[PDB]
Amino acid sequence: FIVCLNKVTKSFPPLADRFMNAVFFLLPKVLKTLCLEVVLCRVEGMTELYFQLKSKDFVQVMRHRDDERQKVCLDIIYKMMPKLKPVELRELLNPVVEFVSHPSTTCREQMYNILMWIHDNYRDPESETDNDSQEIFKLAKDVLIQGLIDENPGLQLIIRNFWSHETRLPSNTLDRLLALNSLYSPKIEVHFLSLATNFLLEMTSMSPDYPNYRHGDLPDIQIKHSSLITPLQAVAQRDPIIAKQLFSSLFSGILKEMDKFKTLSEKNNITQKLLQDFNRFLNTTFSFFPPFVSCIQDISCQHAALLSLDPAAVSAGCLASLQQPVGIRLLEEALLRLAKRVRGKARLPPDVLRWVELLYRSIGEYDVLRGIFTSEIGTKQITQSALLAEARSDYSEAAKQYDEALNKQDWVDGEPTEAEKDFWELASLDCYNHLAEWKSLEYCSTASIDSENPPDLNKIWSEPFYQETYLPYMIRSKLKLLLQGEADQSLLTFIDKAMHGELQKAILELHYSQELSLLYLLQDDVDRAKYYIQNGIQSFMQNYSSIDVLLHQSRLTKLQSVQALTEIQEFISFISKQGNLSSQVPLKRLLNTWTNRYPDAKMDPMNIWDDIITNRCFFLSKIEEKLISSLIRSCKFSMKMKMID
Secondary structure, three states: OHHHHOHHHHOOOOOOOOOHHHHHHOOOOOOHHHHHHHHHHHHHOOOOOOOOOHHHHHHHHHOOOOOOHHHOHHHHHHHHOOOOOHHHHHHHHHHHHHOOOOOOOOOHHHHHHHHHHHHHOOOOOOOOOOOOHHHHHHHHHHHHHHOOOOOOOHHHHHHHHHHHOOOOOOOOOHHHHHHHHHHHOOOOOOOOHHHHHHHHHHHEOEOOOOOOOOOOOOOOOOOOOHHHHOHHHHHHHHOOOOOOHHHHHHHHHHHOHHHHOOOHHHHHHHHHHHHHHHHOHHHHOOOOOOOOOOHHHHHOOOOOOOOOOOOOOOHHHHHHOOOOOHHHHHHHHHOOOOOOOOOOOOOOOOOOOOOOOOOOHHHHHHHHOOOOOOOOHHHHHHHHHHHHOOHHHHHHHOOOHHHHOOOOOOOOOOOHHHHOHHHHHHHHHHHOOOOOOHHHHHHHHHOOOOOOOOOHHHHHHOOOOOOHHHHHHHHHOHHHHHHOOOOOOOHHHHHHHHHHOHHHHHHHHOOOOOOHHHHOOOOOOOHHHHHHHHHHHHHHHHHOOOOOOHHHHHHHHHHOHHHHOHHHHHHHHHHHHHHHHHHHOOHHHHHHHHHHHOOOOOOOOOOHHHHHHHHHHHHHHHHHOOOOHHHHHHHHHHHHHHOOO
16 A cells, blocks of 8 residues: 555655654565655655654664665655754764765765765854764765765766865965865875866966967967966876876975065964874874875975974885985984984984885994994994994993993983983894894893783783884794794794784784794694785785885895795695605605705895795704605705805
8 A cells, every 4th residue: 555655655745644654664564675665755745843763763774775776765864954953963974974885876976965065054163062063074074085086977076076166175276275285184095186186277376277380389389388288287197196296396386475475474384284284194194105105295395394203204104115315304404403402303213214124224323323322332332343243242242231230330421321322222132133033032122021021011012102113023033942842932922912913903913924924834734824925925025116226125125035935935835745745755856855955045145044044944844743764864964064064
């Protein structure tokens, strides 16, 4: 009877109250098809009073339908817009933001335009009547910007774009310049550079966009050819990535007029605000910085007060892949050219910028000490060890006693060393054993928490300030107690925290996966060893995003990565069918592998070449127990003798 009670609605004199019990008890009930009929019926029996019943069973079923036909219910809410309540808006605005990932895009044209109504209507003079209802206004603009681009219809773009235009962006230019930066920051999504271009080129600086063989381009090589080179720009720009050109090529065409006309006082206050918007990039897209083109373009402002601690071009600049000399450029001259006003910090990020590509440590070193420290005895004892290169001897004895003796001397330099050397020595405290592991190292790093062994402050240490840096150091010390017998430490603490931390901590820190592939050789399981290893190669793929002063960057990043990862894929690939096959029938086949492993040469560098010499010896022992013996002994005697001489 109701599916007929809809046809009389195709005309428009039904009473949505004469059958409101009906518009409800059928919603439970094919199930859904029946209900949707009754939804569209309610819309012309709508513009009424009371939402007590409807609101209870609406937001329940809106999300329930991945079905798109019974999703035009979204357009239907639009008549529920005028009849509105502040907090009742909050609970219901929750489905509309969700409607961004479903396939039909029919309701998006309403998902967003209802927010348009709820944006232009809620523009109050910031009366701030409700602290909760103001969460709407911001929560609304988040959909407005997450949806500006990325949808096949370019019209969703123009219609929104033209709406960040009509009464929003000011008809002024420089003012349309202040405002745009307020809009960019919230973006935690790539692109939008194209939006800078389209925004500022169409406008030009006037309501309009342009105000003015051998017979064609010779009479007018001026007025005609300017309006046309103009658009052929911005279009060729959303297609690729390198349009960074214009923005600096706009920031002067920004900076310049702000100089000969308007007072200095305000422009200073305005640009100090810019800092704040840029600091705000380093928190929202903080470590969401693969494009690099977002990062460099901004630090390339090249203005007087561009200095920021820039600790987020430290860590998230590591994702940026960009040796930036910006933090050094101001300290040279612009910032303070006129030990107190010397940058209480901005001198140290130049370290961790010539430190993240460990080459660098030598142009780091000379600038490290005698540069800024003033310990004299600590310098000439640590410096004169980098020259000896025998620091594994000369430095550690000329270093540990500064902390163990509690500054027995006057140590009038041990007091400024406190706010410093406590961190230089922290650099040295692992530097001392370049390698060799030892239980001395595993207690070196771990000694930064409680005196008794503290596993909580370890997992904690990833959370707060610092400490996270020496994270991988403690885990190389696995190697030495990976030689020993007691497989208790680390694994008992860390393979469990990876399960608890998988949702946020483990997989975000499981970038460093070579290690990963190594503990799996304790418990006889290859599959995940391979998985996490293959993610390993294909990440290192990306760190190969650097060819300028390559030879430092590369020699490091290549010469070891592709050297461990092979001597494992080899070991894995070989051991299964090959290992099983070889062990079972031919001893000689096993030898065959050895004369591929003797003429494997080493780069001048130490470390990993030295480092993989553990790999081959666990590859040995892990198969000496899964499986003649004299031959194996000879190989051990041999392989053992090479990596000693």
